[PDB]
Amino acid sequence: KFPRVKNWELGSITYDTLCAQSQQDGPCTPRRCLGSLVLPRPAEQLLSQARDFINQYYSSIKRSGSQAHEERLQEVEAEVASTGTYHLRESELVFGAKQAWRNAPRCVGRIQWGKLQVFDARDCSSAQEMFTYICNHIKYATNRGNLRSAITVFPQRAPGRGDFRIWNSQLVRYAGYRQQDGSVRGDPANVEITELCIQHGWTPGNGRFDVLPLLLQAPDEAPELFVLPPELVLEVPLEHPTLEWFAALGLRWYALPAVSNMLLEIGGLEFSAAPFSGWYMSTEIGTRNLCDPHRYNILEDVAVCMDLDTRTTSSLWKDKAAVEINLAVLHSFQLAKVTIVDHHAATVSFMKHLDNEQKARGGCPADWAWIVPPISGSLTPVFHQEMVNYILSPAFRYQPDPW
Amino acid sequence: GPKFPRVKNWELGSITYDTLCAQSQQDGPCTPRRCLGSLVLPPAEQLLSQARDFINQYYSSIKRSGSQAHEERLQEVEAEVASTGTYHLRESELVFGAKQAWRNAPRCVGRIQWGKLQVFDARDCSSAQEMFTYICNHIKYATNRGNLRSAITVFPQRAPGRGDFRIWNSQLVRYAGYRQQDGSVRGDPANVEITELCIQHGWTPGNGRFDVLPLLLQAPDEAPELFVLPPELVLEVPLEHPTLEWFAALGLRWYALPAVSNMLLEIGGLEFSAAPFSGWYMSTEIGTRNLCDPHRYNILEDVAVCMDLDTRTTSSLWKDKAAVEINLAVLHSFQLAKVTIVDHHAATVSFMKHLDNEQKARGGCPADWAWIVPPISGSLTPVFHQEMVNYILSPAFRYQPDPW
Ligand code: HEM
Ligand code: HEM
Ligand SMILES: N=C(NCCC[C@H](N)C(=O)N[C@@H](CCN)C(N)=O)N[N+](=O)[O-]
Ligand SMILES: N=C(NCCC[C@H](N)C(=O)N[C@@H](CCN)C(N)=O)N[N+](=O)[O-]
Ligand SMILES: C[C@H](O)[C@H](O)[C@H]1CNc2nc(N)[nH]c(=O)c2N1
Numbered sequence: 003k004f005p006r007v008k009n010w011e012l013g014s015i016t017y018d019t020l021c022a023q024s025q026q027d028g029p030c031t032p033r034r035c036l037g038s039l040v041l042p043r044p045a046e047q048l049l050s051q052a053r054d055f056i057n058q059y060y061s062s063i064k065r066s067g068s069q070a071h072e073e074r075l076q077e078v079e080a081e082v083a084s085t086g087t088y089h090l091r092e093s094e095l096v097f098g099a100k101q102a103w104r105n106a107p108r109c110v111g112r113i114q115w116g117k118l119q120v121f122d123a124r125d126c127s128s129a130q131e132m133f134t135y136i137c138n139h140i141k142y143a144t145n146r147g148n149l150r151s152a153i154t155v156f157p158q159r160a161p162g163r164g165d166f167r168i169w170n171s172q173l174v175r176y177a178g179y180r181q182q183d184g185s186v187r188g189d190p191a192n193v194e195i196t197e198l199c200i201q202h203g204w205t206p207g208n209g210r211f212d213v214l215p216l217l218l219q220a221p222d223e224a225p226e227l228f229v230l231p232p233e234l235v236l237e238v239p240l241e242h243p244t245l246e247w248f249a250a251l252g253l254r255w256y257a258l259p260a261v262s263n264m265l266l267e268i269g270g271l272e273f274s275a276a277p278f279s280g281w282y283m284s285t286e287i288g289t290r291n292l293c294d295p296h297r298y299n300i301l302e303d304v305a306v307c308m309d310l311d312t313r314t315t316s317s318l319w320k321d322k323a324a325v326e327i328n329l330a331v332l333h334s335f336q337l338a339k340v341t342i343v344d345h346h347a348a349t350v351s352f353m354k355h356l357d358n359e360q361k362a363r364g365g366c367p368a369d370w371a372w373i374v375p376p377i378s379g380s381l382t383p384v385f386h387q388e389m390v391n392y393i394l395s396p397a398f399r400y401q402p403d404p405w
Numbered sequence: 406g407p408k409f410p411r412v413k414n415w416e417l418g419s420i421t422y423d424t425l426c427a428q429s430q431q432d433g434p435c436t437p438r439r440c441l442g443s444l445v446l447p448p449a450e451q452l453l454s455q456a457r458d459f460i461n462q463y464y465s466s467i468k469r470s471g472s473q474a475h476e477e478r479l480q481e482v483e484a485e486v487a488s489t490g491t492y493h494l495r496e497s498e499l500v501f502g503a504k505q506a507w508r509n510a511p512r513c514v515g516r517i518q519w520g521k522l523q524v525f526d527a528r529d530c531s532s533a534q535e536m537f538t539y540i541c542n543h544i545k546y547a548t549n550r551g552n553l554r555s556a557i558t559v560f561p562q563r564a565p566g567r568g569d570f571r572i573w574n575s576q577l578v579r580y581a582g583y584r585q586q587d588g589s590v591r592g593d594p595a596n597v598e599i600t601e602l603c604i605q606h607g608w609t610p611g612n613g614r615f616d617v618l619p620l621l622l623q624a625p626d627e628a629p630e631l632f633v634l635p636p637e638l639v640l641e642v643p644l645e646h647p648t649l650e651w652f653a654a655l656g657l658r659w660y661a662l663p664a665v666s667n668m669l670l671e672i673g674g675l676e677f678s679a680a681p682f683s684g685w686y687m688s689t690e691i692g693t694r695n696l697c698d699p700h701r702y703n704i705l706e707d708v709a710v711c712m713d714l715d716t717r718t719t720s721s722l723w724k725d726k727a728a729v730e731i732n733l734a735v736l737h738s739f740q741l742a743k744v745t746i747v748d749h750h751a752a753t754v755s756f757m758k759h760l761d762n763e764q765k766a767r768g769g770c771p772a773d774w775a776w777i778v779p780p781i782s783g784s785l786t787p788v789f790h791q792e793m794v795n796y797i798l799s800p801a802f803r804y805q806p807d808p809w
């Protein structure tokens with residue numbers, strides 16, 4: 003029943019009893035674990051999810067069982083029985099948003115979960131309106147390099163009607179232009195979305211870091227193209243602290259990470275468009291985006307620049323190159339006074355979070371493969387920490403691409 | 406589409422379906438409610454079906470499934486288990502089972518070599534002293550003066566009532582761990598307990614940072630006897646860095662032969678409580694875990710100081726910089742001393758090749774992602790981008806309780 007969770011660096015042991023609160027199934031079975039896979043292969047229902055969430059809400063404000071709680075439960079009941087759905091009060095939406103983040107098994111920056119600026123954009127009715135909301139989110143979230151965690155929530159999904167959607171995976175991304183020989187100019191992960199924009203009328207550029215335009219879609223309407231104001235998108239030029247030649251690579255990366263393709267679920271209500279943003283962990287840029295073989299794959303260039311023996315693996319030219327690249331990122335952002343957290347500082351904070359959560363809820367869902375950084379795994383405390391992964395709600399989930 | 410786990414490699418975009426998982430006959434630690442994938446430690450009738458299953462596996466491997474020899478061996482096993490409670494494997498069956506266990510090991514990234522394993526049968530062994538002889542022969546052959554050769558020595562199987570054959574040490578070669586007066590540990594903290602058992606058993610302990618421990622071998626129903634390994638047999642590699650001339654002055658060293666010895670080899674229901682196996686190292690086992698783990702030698706800070714790095718702030722990546730040089734030092738000294746070793750880049754690339762081989766051969770390959778991805782430079786190796794299905798196949802290697 004209750005799993006024994008152990009830390010092999012300290013020898014400490016805990017028991018996760020929070021997992022018993024999981025109402026949704028994961029991909030694993032007793033016959034085989036599929037935990038390393040990235041994606042997941044009625045009034046009665048909604049009403050129970052709803053009641054559960056309203057319960058979670060009143061416990062949070064410690065007025066559980068009070069009159070306000072009973073009344074709110076009747077309100078939800080009344081509305082669903084009559085209309086087959088219901089709506090969240092703004093304070094409830096704020097609570098749910100923070101809970102969804104807190105329960106995100108794959109997020110290592112959850113120690114911040116309680117500090118989330120929630121923008122209610124549920125009174126939105128057009129791509130143009132979505133665009134203004136998104137532009138405000140960015141201005142606020144970016145805050146002159148002193149990033150602030152924020153989420154903007156658009157109109158919930160409705161039976162029969164189409165979903166409100168942001169077609170980009172993130173609010174800010176660089177284009178990927180397929181060229182003559184199947185090669186790619188820019189970010190290879192964004193080839194498809196870069197072409198969808200062009201197909202909808204965007205005048206493509208020809209650089210390695212062309213910030214893409216947003217394709218916003220209001221219910222049952224073809225998406226609309228919007229270009230983000232260059233001054234709204236803060237970027238950081240990457241230069242190395244000692245290798246004067248690094249800058250010559252002209253590498254640069256935007257300061258704001260803001261997933262916009264995930265779905266936010268609360269009390270059974272589904273918000274198909276709810277972009278969120280906190281701040282980068284340096285490895286996301288230095289390791290994954292700049293070094294993945296299917297991304298900017300610059301590992302070799304930096305290696306040759308450092309004059310390394312890229313002739314053999316055992317020379318570890320790749321490992322050496324990666325480290326400087328990550329150092330270059332940390333340095334640059336620090337130099338541009340833009341918020342960023344290295345993977346050591348980040349994982350250290352997660353461990354406290356795991357402790358805070360152990361005492362607060364008796365456990366914490368975590369996905370090991372995602373919590374452990376892409377470089378220097380065992381050198382971080384999370385590597386040595388066993389973790390239990392299960393699905394809690396409020397939750398952020400993946401959803402199909404709208405095309 | 407196919408009703409089997411879909412597996413994707415996000416670097417190449419390719420897909421496969423694992424159908425091999427259908428063959429697993431033992432539940433794992435997970436359930437639809439929660440994944441415990443990251444946890445390290447998560448009846449004549451029953452023995453009969455396990456054995457029949459194995460025999461079938463054997464005859465399939467030699468392409469004689471359904472034949473008379475097959476149907477006769479099955480008859481033979483039932484007869485034997487029927488009038489004794491257990492049964493015995495044939496030479497060729499043990500060799501096939503030992504290799505399959507290696508082959509089925511979810512946590513081993515070196516499985517591409519599973520085919521080339523030297524199986525030393527030692528089921529005749531009847532004393533602790535003879536256990537020592539067998540082990541010394543293993544080390545001698547496996548070490549092969551630096552050109553390591555995969556091998557496993559199988560001792561007598563667990564018998565009804567009779568005591569198990571057990572090697573008390575975790576590996577045939579391990580360094581001592583001495584608890585100090587002030588609380589710290591001299592040597593390898595991981596082996597503090599076994600070092601204490603070697604002493605409670607008459608061993609005259611040394612006081613170095615790298616003292617090779619003696620072996621505590623145990624024959625059925627007898628207390629363990631203490632055997633000291635002849636130094637000439639235990640090959641060690643002094644570590645030095647290729648350009649940091651001062652690294653050699655740290656006096657760090659590591660043995661060449663990794664030989665797990667506390668694992669139980671299970672074949673067709675038979676349990677081999679003592680069956681030490683050895684291959685060769687992946688540089689990160691030494692350079693990253695053993696030398697840099699906080700609870701091991703913990704030399705990260707020392708090395709960082711020597712490189713004159715700013716250990717006051719995390720964002721300097723002093724830990725990352727040192728770990729890299731240490732790992733390179735392990736690779737450089739092994740290459741220098743002509744001792745077999747493989748870095749995490751070559752190792753993982755060869756494992757990708759293995760996955761591709763097993764896809765065609767068995768329709769899948771059970772793998773533990775957390776154990777396959779190396780402790781450093783994770784996403785720089787191809788396995789990180791490879792999804793993996795994990796399940797228990799038999800024969801297999803299993804953890805077993807400490808004999809004491
Ligand atoms: C305060 C700064 C934060 C940091 C440093 C942080 C860091 C991370 C990192 C490293 C990842 C993995 C990214 C990847 O490898 O693709 C992640 C995933 C995630 N984070 Fe956070 N996070 C932070 C804030 C937030 C906020 C504000 C939210 C939303 C309210 C959030 C929601 C999530 C979710 C949903 C995932 C998993 C997404 C997926 O499955 O792909 N994070 N976070
Ligand atoms: C040929 C060279 C080999 C290499 C490079 C190799 C490499 C590895 C590595 C890196 C690990 C993980 C070590 C750890 O983190 O504790 C491992 C685990 C394992 N290997 Fe291999 N291996 C090789 C040969 C063998 C052989 C000969 C066998 C058995 C016949 C074997 C059986 C296993 C098993 C069962 C595990 C997991 C044990 C556990 O759960 O602690 N390996 N191997
Ligand atoms: N630090 C954050 N990182 C989010 C990183 C998102 C990642 N770069 C990405 O592209 N994720 C894919 C999912 C990749 N499996 C997506 N569709 O958004 N988030 N934040 O709020 O501060
Ligand atoms: N390279 C190998 N490494 C074996 C790794 C052994 C590891 N150092 C260790 O101490 N393992 C624990 C098991 C930890 N789960 C043990 N009890 O032997 N194996 N080989 O045959 O080539
Ligand atoms: C196949 C494997 O699950 C996949 O590559 C995972 C591993 N760990 C990860 N960890 C983080 N933070 N982000 C990722 O995208 C991944 N990808």
Ligand SMILES: C[C@H](O)[C@H](O)[C@H]1CNc2nc(N)[nH]c(=O)c2N1
Nearest residue numbers: 385386387388443444445775776
């Ligand atoms: C808690 C976590 O399971 C533990 O630290 C695991 C992770 N991956 C590992 N991988 C290998 N090869 N060896 C190990 O000892 C571990 N330890």
Ligand SMILES: [Zn+2]
Nearest residue numbers: 030035440442
């Ligand atoms: Zn699992």
